Amino acid sequence: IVEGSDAEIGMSPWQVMLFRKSPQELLCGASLISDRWVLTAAHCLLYPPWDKNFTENDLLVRIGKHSRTRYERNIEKISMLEKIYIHPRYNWRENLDRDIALMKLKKPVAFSDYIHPVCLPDRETAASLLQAGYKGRVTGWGNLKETWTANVGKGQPSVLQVVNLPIVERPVCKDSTRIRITDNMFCAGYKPDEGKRGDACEGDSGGPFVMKSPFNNRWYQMGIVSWGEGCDRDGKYGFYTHVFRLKKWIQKVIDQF
Amino acid sequence: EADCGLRPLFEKKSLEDKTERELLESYID
Amino acid sequence: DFEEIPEEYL
Ligand SMILES: N=C(N)c1ccc(C[C@@H](NC(=O)CNS(=O)(=O)c2ccc3ccccc3c2)C(=O)N2CCCCC2)cc1
């Protein structure tokens, strides 16, 4: 997270960390949408062009974390995947369209003060919160800078980082990339004349872009950290997966009934 | 049905986080 | 960096 802040403890109880077994390393961010399901970006598990293709046994899921590196024995919970689901039409070849993916935990997790699920939006909610100008929040343990002087510092944060960015008008988004953006994406960030900065960055992928409803006081996950051209560049914005549109697929996969 | 979106140490404790208002105000602009 | 997690997971 570029230009973010240390999050307060228990500020994003739905924040999940995607941990790789060997080598041990932080793969991506993710979110807990329930007792056994985790929502993340597809590109975190599969991106052929870089020979990226994780399977259920290569990863671990760590829920309830604050610190990036510590093993929070009393608070966090480590889970194993039972099955991974990637959107059938995830376009890793040209624009990362439908960059979404669900992961099914082996055993349900016990909610706590540190572990709590985020909500998925419904038609009206999406309709009224997803408006240009409105602010969303992004969280993660990714890079603090797009680039930095080697060995002179630490590109990564110690604790979970948080940033609040505004939603940008589609047209403004479209004119900022040579990429073919779809209706399954959205962009956020401040504009050059806005006076503020902020962005997600490598390591933040899969993380949730949430929004709070003033009428019910609940947090809704409206987007997923997807892709971006650098980090915190002027005249550039971050692209998020449009959770609401891909909701039927989620629905279809989950099978709560 | 299942509760979600209500942070156990915040909403449920009637407390708010440090930059939450920046979110809320952005609505009533 | 990472502190080591229980090996059962690794
Ligand atoms: N908000 C941001 N500033 C942000 C958000 C996410 C990331 C991580 C993300 N990296 C990038 O998007 C690097 N940007 S990029 O190199 O401009 C890039 C590369 C490949 C692309 C393929 C399809 C569509 C867009 C692409 C954009 C990543 O790991 N990806 C996996 C590999 C494909 C690209 C995405 C980086 C920055």
Angle at CA of residue A41, ends A111 and A119, nearest 5° = 40
Look up residue A44 and give its DSSP letter.
G
Contact in structure between A126 and A212 (CB atoms under 8 Å) = no
> H or E element: which one contains A29?
strand A25-32
Name which of A153, A160, A154, A174 is nearest A208 in CA terms. A160
Q: How far is the CA of A205 from the centre of ligand 1 (A)?
A: 9
Burial of A233: CB neighbours in 10 Å, binned 0-12, 13-18, 19+:
middle
- Contact exists between B and C (3 or more beta carbon pairs < 8 Å): no
Domains of chain B: 1-29 (4.10.140.10)
- The answer to whether B23 contacts A136, with C-beta atoms less than 8 Å apart, is yes
CATH topology of domain A1-12+118-244: Thrombin, subunit H (2.40.10)
Experimental determination approach used: X-ray
Measured CA to CA, the distance from residue A119 to residue A94 in angstroms comes to 30
Give the count of alpha carbons within 13 A of A132, CB side only: 10
A50, A225, A227, A240: which to mutate for ligand 1, most atoms within 8 A of CB? A227
Q: Is the CB of A19 under 6 A from ligand 1?
A: no
Closest CA to A144 of A213, A69, A99, A201: A201
Determine the 3-state secondary structure of A88 from DSSP: coil
CA–CA dist A17, A44 (Å, integer):
12
Q: Whose CA is nearest to atom 23 of ligand 1?
A: A95
Strands A238-242 and A219-227, by their bridges, are antiparallel
Burial B1-29 (b: 16+ CB within 10 A, else e): eeebbbbebbbeeeeebebbeebeebbee
Q: Give CA–CA dist A176/A188, Å, rounded.
A: 12
Instruction: Decide if B22 and A134 are in contact by the 8 Å CB cutoff.
Output: no
Instruction: Check whether the bond before A23 is cis (ω within 30° of 0).
Output: yes
Asked if A80 lies within 8 A of C9 by C-beta distance, the reply is yes
Instruction: For A158-227, give the DSSP string.
Output: SB-EEEEEEBPPHHHHHTT-SS---TTEEEE---GGGS---B--TT-TT-EEEEE-TTT--EEEEEEEEE
Q: Is the dihedral of CA A169, A174, A179, A183 positive or negative?
A: positive
How far apart, in whole angstroms, are the C-alpha atoms of residue B23 and residue A37?
A: 27
- CA-nearest of A243, A2, A239 to A129 is A243
Identity of the residue in B17, B22, B24 whose CB atom sits nearest the CB atom of A214: B24
Question: Which residue from A113, A211, A217 is facing B8, i.e. has the nearest CB?
Answer: A113
Q: Give the separation between CA A61 and CA A38, rounded to whole angstroms.
A: 9
CATH fold of A13-117+245-257 = Thrombin, subunit H (2.40.10)
Distances from the Cα of A28 to the Cα of A62, A226, B20, angstroms = 11, 11, 24
Return the domain boundaries, chain A: 1-12+118-244, 13-117+245-257
Q: Are A177 and A229 in contact (CB under 8 A)?
A: yes
